[PDB]
Amino acid sequence: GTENLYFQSMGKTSWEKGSLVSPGGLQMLLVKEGVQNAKTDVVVNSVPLDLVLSRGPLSKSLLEKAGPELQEELDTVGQGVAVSMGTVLKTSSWNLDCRYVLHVVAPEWRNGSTSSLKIMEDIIRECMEITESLSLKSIAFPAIGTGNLGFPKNIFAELIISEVFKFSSKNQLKTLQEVHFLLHPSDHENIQAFSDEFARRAN
Ligand SMILES: Nc1ncnc2c1ncn2[C@@H]1O[C@H](COP(=O)(O)OP(=O)(O)OC[C@H]2O[C@H](O)[C@H](O)[C@@H]2O)[C@@H](O)[C@H]1O
């Protein structure tokens, strides 16, 4: 579709549809759209420890589109469990076009803490594992961590893309076929970072 970005080839004289396929067959797509318009089976949201969905711009976009039930169901899920760093909570999608939202408590950059890298990578891995376990086909990651949590966008781009490759190399997948990277149309920094990394991988 028209929301599928291209990336410029490293030689600069060509442009390629924003699509990369791992050797194992897992497809990654560069998509320019609001997370609120995602149509994958799963969409990933980053949330604080207290699970309030109206504090960050990403989550707030999801809340407004989905309706107040998203906050209500999230709070329901969180009641029985001790919510901590890295926890993933699943809800239904309400007025969103996806089937499930995976709400993740993502870490602060903390000046490039190695702890934060590891935690973010493991969140990303886990969300894909969950998606496969639910027998679902596709998952959309927006650029979680790159706003209030302060992950540099170039570093986040290579982090998530490398994790998707790694996950694909280590797993035989029965249903998970697509990972979409959802970039907000005005987030020119993320669009560049993700495009640059696709160019590198393709070369
Ligand atoms: N509607 C959208 N669609 C797609 N991407 C978006 C959208 N809106 C913003 N972005 C991009 O979404 C990315 C992330 O922006 P943030 O919402 O700050 O999430 P964080 O993971 O950094 O952490 C902040 C939250 O977590 C902490 O617990 C705080 O309490 C907050 O609740 C940015 O690159 C935006 O450009």
Q: Where are the domains of the chain?
A: 1-203
Superfamily designation of domain 1-203: Leucine Aminopeptidase, subunit E, domain 1 (3.40.220.10)
Q: What is the distance in A from the centroid of ligand 1 to the CA of 33? A: 14
C-alpha torsion 110→125→41→77, nearest 10: -70
SS (H, E, C) the chain: CCCECEEECCCCCCEEECEEECCCCCEEEEEECCHHHCCCCEEEEECCCCCCCCCCHHHHHHHHHHCCHHHHHHHHHHHCCCCCCCCEEEEECCCCCCCEEEEECCCCCCCCCHHHHHHHHHHHHHHHHHHHHCCCCEEEEECCCCCCCCCCHHHHHHHHHHHHHHHHHHCCCCCCCEEEEEECCCCHHHHHHHHHHHHHHHC
Q: Name the residue at shortest CA distance from atom 28 of ligand 1.
A: 48
For this PDB entry, the determination method is: X-ray
**Cβ–ligand 1 contact at 149 (below 6 Å):** yes
Q: What is the distance in A from the centroid of ligand 1 to the CA of 61? A: 9
Documented resolution in Å: 2.2
Cβ(58)–Cβ(46) below 8 Å: yes
**Cβ–ligand 1 contact at 40 (below 6 Å):** no
